[PDB]
Design a protein around this ligand. Structure first.
Ligand SMILES: *[C@@H]1O[C@H](CO)[C@@H](O[C@@H]2O[C@H](CO)[C@@H](O[C@@H]3O[C@H](CO)[C@@H](O)[C@H](O)[C@@H]3O)[C@H](O)[C@H]2NC(C)=O)[C@H](O)[C@H]1NC(C)=O
Ligand SMILES: *[C@@H]1O[C@H](CO)[C@@H](O)[C@H](O)[C@H]1NC(C)=O
Ligand SMILES: *[C@@H]1O[C@H](CO)[C@@H](O)[C@H](O)[C@H]1NC(C)=O
Ligand SMILES: *[C@H]1O[C@H](CO)[C@@H](O)[C@H](O)[C@H]1NC(C)=O
Lengths: 166, 572
């Protein structure tokens, strides 16, 4: 194929895309997304990577804020980030491990920016709302049974009284 | 005293004008249906109601007895007055069952219509519960389990069947127990619905974007105002709400004193019924406008989110008030990207939503459940409203069943063969067996059919026969003289003109218009649920359903002429 495309990049395969909607989640009193917020986000990602590598693989890897490389920043606050080795640029953590790390500690990142799973979308990490607990058997069935029983008792006693009277 | 006023309110206020009227109003555009109803009230409601009350008071007999005394070869019309009522008892109590259902699922903190079920991954929501509202999904799937088409119908659903059986047992218990204590019950069972409606009106008026529904319901769109179907539905609805044709009014009037005032009673009953229907429509359409506004805002928010995601704009840059301008700017910037998703963009407006937000036979249930889910203590208001609706339905069914059983009670041959109490049980069992059809997967379609035609033509024909017999057979002058002798203050010329040549002519003209419209269109279709689109789609009626509806109408219409022919043969 003669030519080239201006979209492919060597780090595009291992990149995770983050889209942030501060205004929708917070309405007013919404902070601006300057470079300090980006630094805080990179630090949170590095902390999550440290937690995953410590509590799952039992390996002490000293990640840093400079190991979370960010590209394609947009006014939407939508970018692509990927995590490299602590001092080995040629080594990029596979996207599966990064996704598992984010799933493990997404709550901390969500609370760091006061966002809830809808204004902080990782585009590949789908949160779980939680199973809905059910009543023991059925409240409606118990109420229906009680009502039917009392109605039947009333019908029977009224019929018996009417028969006895006549 | 106030006891008479409360009794009149109880007789005027029923489940009919509270439940059926909002659904008809929403179906026929709102105002374009509201205007004829007021027009059909001062023309057909008060005059015919006063005529029926006067006939019942003067004849001092039951419906069958009165229409036999008026004319022998006409007596069979009284039999028709039962048959139509029987058809009502075929399906009306089913509504009560639904109330029971919505009552029974009202003792849970996670109300079933409040939160959509999970898809299975515990990560999202059901496609049907996402495209449609939670209340709509609960009504059409977890309550009715309706089939997409009438052709495919499943077995008898057990839970609705049990609810219907419980409703019939409650009706039978009320029949056996309550015979004269209603005077005390009038002190409480006549004012509670008004309080509930006041509370729900307050809640609706406290909701954002509720005035849109009120504007829609009061807007008389002339484009759909000329539809004869709206006039026919308004006429049959007011006749059903006032109880005309059923013969219960005649039976009640036969039990009053000869000097009891009837014109004031009829006018008060008609006006109270109309006012209650208007108030219920106001509240229901306020909540409906709230739903339409919510859906419109949700659609705009989804469109804006899609555009922001696919064009990478700021979170607050794109708003509803400046949507089309940004769309034009995007089209002018790079039309390739805009056209790559142009079919995905959806055009949603308030008018389209208000036309098709919520519709069907269960409009009241869905609308009031939506109102309940946005309350503070949802369970309390839900229980109160559902208990009020159940009480109204129980009262209406008690009236209908008493009207049905009165000719059977008066039957000396039947009374001498079986106990009087066992007749009520047999009638309840037969009605439950017949109405178990509505508990199937496609039972909602049959319920709609029997709510659209089992009382549309029958009531009109019965009223026409009654008014013709009163005006021309017995003689208007003789009837006026009898009424003047009974109570004095003979009927004013307005009532005489209405009974002579206004109401019958209007009924005949409306029937002719409806028949001509049906013949010309020839496309009588029914709404059917579509889970794929999460909406309602019009589908042509099948041959068997049309035949069943025709038979149901024809039996009631021909009950009187067949007996007339039999009487003529007996005389000859
Ligand atoms: C930084 O990370 C990269 C991985 O992304 C490391 O490269 C890996 O280095 C090891 C050690 O040489 C390679 O193993 C060797 O591979 C050759 C290939 O022929 C094989 O003949 C040897 O027997 C041995 O198995 C490994 O293949 C290589 N992986 C990649 C993807 O290049 C690199 O060493 C890291 N740098 C530091 C300083 O740790
Ligand atoms: C749920 O999981 C199944 C697993 O096969 C998947 O096919 C489906 O897309 C998932 N649901 C959603 C909404 O992604
Ligand atoms: C919306 O309006 C445009 C404007 O012509 C039209 O092309 C399109 O079919 C309409 N419907 C949708 C769903 O986009
Ligand atoms: C959803 O489920 C996953 C695993 O099934 C769990 O880690 C996560 O905490 C759940 N989310 C809740 C319960 O909010």
């Amino acid at each position: 194929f003669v030519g080239w495309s201006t979209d492919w990049s060597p780090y595009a395969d291992q990149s995770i895309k983050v889209r942030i909607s501060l205004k929708s989640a917070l309405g007013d009193k919404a902070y601006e997304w300057n470079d300090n917020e980006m630094y805080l986000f990179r630090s949170s990602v590095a902390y999550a990577m440290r937690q995953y590598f410590l509590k799952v693989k039992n390996q002490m890897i000293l990640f840093g804020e400079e190991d979370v490389r960010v590209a394609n920043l947009k006014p939407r606050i939508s970018f692509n980030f990927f995590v490299t080795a602590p001092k080995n640029v040629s080594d990029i953590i596979p996207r599966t491990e990064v996704e598992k790390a984010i799933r493990m500690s997404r709550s901390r990142i969500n609370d760091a920016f006061r966002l809830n799973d809808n204004s902080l979308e990782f585009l590949g990490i789908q949160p779980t709302l939680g199973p809905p607990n059910q009543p023991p058997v059925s409240i409606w069935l118990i109420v229906f049974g009680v009502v039917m029983g009392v109605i039947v008792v009333g019908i029977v006693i009224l019929i018996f009284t009417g028969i006895r009277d006549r | 005293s106030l006891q008479f006023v409360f009794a009149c309110i109880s007789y005027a206020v029923g489940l009919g004008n509270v439940w059926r009227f909002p659904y008809l109003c929403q179906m026929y555009g709102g105002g374009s249906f509201l205007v004829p109803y007021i027009i059909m009230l001062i023309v057909e409601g008060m005059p015919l109601l006063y005529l029926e009350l006067a006939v019942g008071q003067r004849m001092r007999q039951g419906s069958i007895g009165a229409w036999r005394t008026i004319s022998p070869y006409l007596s069979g019309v009284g039999v028709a007055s039962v048959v139509v009522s029987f058809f009502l008892s075929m399906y009306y109590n089913v509504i009560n069952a639904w109330a029971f259902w919505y009552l029974f699922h009202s003792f849970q903190d996670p109300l079933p219509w409040s939160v959509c079920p999970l898809n299975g991954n515990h990560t999202g929501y059901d496609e049907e519960c996402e495209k449609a509202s939670s209340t709509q999904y609960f009504w059409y799937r977890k309550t009715l389990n309706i089939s997409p088409s009438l052709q495919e119908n499943g077995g008898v659903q057990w839970e609705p069947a049990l609810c219907l059986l419980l409703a019939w047992l409650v009706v039978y218990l009320c029949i056996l127990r309550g015979t004269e204590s209603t005077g005390k019950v009038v002190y409480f069972t006549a004012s509670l619905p008004y309080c509930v409606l006041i509370i729900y009106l307050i809640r609706g008026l406290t909701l954002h974007g509720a005035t849109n529904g009120l504007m829609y319901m009061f807007t008389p769109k002339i484009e759909q105002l000329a539809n004869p179907k709206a006039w026919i539905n308004a006429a049959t609805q007011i006749f059903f709400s006032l109880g005309l044709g059923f013969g219960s009014l005649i039976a009640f009037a036969s039990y009053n004193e000869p000097s009891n005032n009837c014109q004031k009673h009829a006018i008060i009953v008609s006006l109270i019924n109309s006012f209650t229907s208007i108030f219920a429509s106001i509240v229901t359409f306020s909540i409906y406008g709230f739903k339409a506004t919510f859906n419109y805002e949700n659609c705009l928010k989804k469109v804006s989110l899609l555009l922001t995601n696919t064009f990478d704009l700021e979170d607050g840059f794109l708003t509803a008030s400046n949507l089309e301008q940004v769309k034009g700017y995007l089209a002018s910037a790079y039309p390739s990207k805009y056209s790559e998703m142009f079919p995905q963009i959806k055009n949603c407006s308030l008018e389209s939503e208000l036309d098709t937000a919520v519709q069907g036979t269960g409009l009241a249930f869905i609308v009031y459940t939506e109102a309940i889910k946005n309350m503070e203590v949802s369970q309390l208001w839900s229980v109160l409203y559902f208990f009020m609706l159940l009480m109204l339905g129980i009262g209406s069914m008690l009236g209908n069943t008493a009207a049905i059983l009165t000719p059977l009670t008066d039957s000396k041959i039947i009374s001498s063969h079986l106990p009087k109490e066992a007749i009520s049980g047999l009638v309840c069992l037969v009605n439950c067996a017949i109405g178990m059809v509505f508990t199937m997967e496609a039972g909602n379609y049959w319920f709609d059919i029997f709510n659209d035609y089992a009382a549309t033509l029958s009531l009109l024909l019965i009223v026409l026969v009654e008014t013709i017999a009163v005006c021309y057979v017995y003689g208007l002058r003789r009837f006026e003289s009898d009424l003047k002798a009974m109570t004095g203050r003979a009927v004013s010329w307005y009532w005489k003109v209405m009974w002579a040549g206004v109401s019958p002519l209007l009924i005949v003209s409306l029937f002719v218009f409806y028949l001509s419209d049906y013949i010309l269109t020839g496309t009588l279709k029914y709404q059917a649920w579509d889970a794929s689109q999460g909406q309602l789609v019009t589908k042509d009626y099948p041959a068997y359903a049309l035949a069943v509806i025709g038979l149901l109408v024809a039996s009631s219409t021909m009950c009187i002429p067949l007996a007339a022919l039999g009487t003529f043969v007996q005389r000859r």
